[PDB]
Amino acid sequence: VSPKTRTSNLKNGLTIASESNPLVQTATVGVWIDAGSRNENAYNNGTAHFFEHLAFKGTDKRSQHQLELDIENMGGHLNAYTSRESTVYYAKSFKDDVPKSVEILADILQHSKLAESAIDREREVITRELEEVNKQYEEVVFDHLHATAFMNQPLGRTILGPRENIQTITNTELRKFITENYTADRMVLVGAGAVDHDALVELAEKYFSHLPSSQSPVPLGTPIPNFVGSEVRLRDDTMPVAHIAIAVEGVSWTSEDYYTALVAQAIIGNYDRAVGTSRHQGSRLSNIVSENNLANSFQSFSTSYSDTGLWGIYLTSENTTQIDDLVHFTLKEWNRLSTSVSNLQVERAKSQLKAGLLLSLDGTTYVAEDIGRQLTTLGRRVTPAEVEAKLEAVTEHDVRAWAQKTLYDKDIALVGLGPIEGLYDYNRIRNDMSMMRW
Amino acid sequence: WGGFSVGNPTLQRFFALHYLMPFVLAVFALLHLIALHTAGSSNPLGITSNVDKLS
Numbered sequence: 398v399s400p401k402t403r404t405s406n407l408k409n410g411l412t413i414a415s416e417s418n419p420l421v422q423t424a425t426v427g428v429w430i431d432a433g434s435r436n437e438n439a440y441n442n443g444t445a446h447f448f449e450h451l452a453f454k455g456t457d458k459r460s461q462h463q464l465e466l467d468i469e470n471m472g473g474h475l476n477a478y479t480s481r482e483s484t485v486y487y488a489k490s491f492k493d494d495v496p497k498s499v500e501i502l503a504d505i506l507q508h509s510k511l512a513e514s515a516i517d518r519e520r521e522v523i524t525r526e527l528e529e530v531n532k533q534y535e536e537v538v539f540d541h542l543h544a545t546a547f548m549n550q551p552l553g554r555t556i557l558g559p560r561e562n563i564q565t566i567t568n569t570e571l572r573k574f575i576t577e578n579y580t581a582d583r584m585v586l587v588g589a590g591a592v593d594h595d596a597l598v599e600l601a602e603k604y605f606s607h608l609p610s611s612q613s614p615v616p617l618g619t620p621i622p623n624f625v626g627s628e629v630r631l632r633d634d635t636m637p638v639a640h641i642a643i644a645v646e647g648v649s650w651t652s653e654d655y656y657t658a659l660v661a662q663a664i665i666g667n668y669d670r671a672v673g674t675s676r677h678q679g680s681r682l683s684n685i686v687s688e689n690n691l692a693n694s695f696q697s698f699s700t701s702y703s704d705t706g707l708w709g710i711y712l713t714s715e716n717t718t719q720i721d722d723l724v725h726f727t728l729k730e731w732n733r734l735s736t737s738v739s740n741l742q743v744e745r746a747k748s749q750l751k752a753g754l755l756l757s758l759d760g761t762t763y764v765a766e767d768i769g770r771q772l773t774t775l776g777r778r779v780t781p782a783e784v785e786a787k788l789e790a791v792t793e794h795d796v797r798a799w800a801q802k803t804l805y806d807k808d809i810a811l812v813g814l815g816p817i818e819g820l821y822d823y824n825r826i827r828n829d830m831s832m833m834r835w
Numbered sequence: 836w837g838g839f840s841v842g843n844p845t846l847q848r849f850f851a852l853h854y855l856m857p858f859v860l861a862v863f864a865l866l867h868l869i870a871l872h873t874a875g876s877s878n879p880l881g882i883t884s885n886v887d888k889l890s
């Protein structure tokens with residue numbers, strides 16, 4: 398039984414949430430923000446990512462060089478990432494270096510220079526990032542997947558933004574973005590590891606007390622997405638490996654089917670030929686794929702957002718004449734979530750998940766990420782007892798009922814990259830979303 | 836004719852051959868499709884379709 402997550406508020410509405418571990422000597426403190434690329438419009442798309450670069454480019458006090466030195470002297474490191482719905486800025490340090498790290502984070506968030514000279518310098522760095530993501534095939538695939546599934550909607554935009562915006566982002570629009578979005582009621586200060594909650598609340602009162610509150614404070618993790626069944630083909634015959642993602646509209650964080658979708662995802666599961674145990678996994682798809690050498694890997698996913706999600710699978714394969722078989726067998730395993738699954742598969746997946754959801758949290762950064770994600774999506778940290786109860790409530794009837802309304806005979810979004818000549822057209826893929834025998 | 840003019844022998848032989856010939860015709864129809872399958876169908880532009888195939 399893990400220690401209790403303590404939670405306090407300030408007057409402005411900043412949440413402080415902490416989970417102490419007296420067995421470790423490091424601590425991860427940081428700020429989780431319920432804001433991301435989705436908060437931009439089409440004209441300033443890319444701003445949130447642009448800001449993340451400038452946050453480390455110097456503040457009103459410390460210059461770029463002083464900032465570097467201050468963190469070097471702390472001994473740990475700082476890290477940040479911007480997603481579609483969430484921004485994180487954290488600092489991993491030693492136990493007694495926590496007041497330094499909180500102070501630096503408070504500085505870079507509230508008091509950043511955003512000097513025209515630095516805007517102009519990063520404008521090239523970010524322009525170069527546009528031509529080098531091209532190599533990270535999984536990210537290429539998932540960014541096209543969002544672009545097509547949520548065609549012309551805010552979730553469909555990339556985080557980097559178009560080349561055109563990168564050239565026209567001003568310090569004005571950067572400042573406007575962080576003034577509108579980085580408000581106290583949307584922020585959580587999180588500490589995990591060797592942190593005292595009461596110490597962290599004092600540091601919050603010292604550094605984050607003059608944060609703006611929004612005019613209309615909605616609860617944390619408050620949002621209409623209209624999924625488009627569609628496909629993007631990025632054929633490249635010179636690549637040896639095909640990367641394919643197939644997804645349907647999935648579930649939001651607060652859906653009543655959130656756990657049912659996780660159990661269904663666990664019934665299909667993951668596979669990787671390079672891992673020794675993967676040839677012996679219980680999943681039917683795993684057995685088909687491994688016995689027939691259909692793929693190097695596959696990974697089931699169930700991504701959630703505040704008001705929608707994508708549920709599906711990501712496949713990689715060198716077997717370019719049997720891509721059809723790989724896709725066929727994958728979608729026939731999905732069909733069986735509607736037609737055939739019983740207590741046998743459901744209870745096995747629940748067993749595997751009850752541990753999996755706890756196992757994931759194995760370091761201070763993972764714990765901090767879990768507290769931060771849960772607080773900014775659900776408004777609370779859900780105790781393992783509650784999670785165990787929600788998983789236990791999933792029956793085989795729930796899985797079949799969910800699959801029949803979410804997967805069965807539904808439109809898919811499909812992205813293929815690489816040697817995908819063998820991937821059939823949209824209709825033949827989408828026809829595998831049902832079984833004529835049922 | 837099987838005789839000196841068109842008559843009964845000719846009619847009976849035309850019946851047997853008229854029954855047979857459609858089966859021969861079906862075999863040749865199949866042969867020309869098997870022969871075609873090496874190049875595939877041509878298309879109205881006259882160019883290769885190897886770049887863009889549909890089931």
Ligand code: HEM
Pocket residue numbers: 860864867868871875876877878
């Ligand atoms: C019983 C008579 C026949 C049947 C059932 C038949 C059936 C077919 C079929 C199904 C195809 C492929 C689809 C199409 O292109 O329409 C085809 C292609 C072709 N047939 Fe026929 N056919 C017959 C007679 C003929 C005759 C009399 C010729 C030539 C004098 C011919 C020459 C061809 C050729 C050259 C093609 C390839 C055309 C292409 O796709 O570019 N067929 N036939």
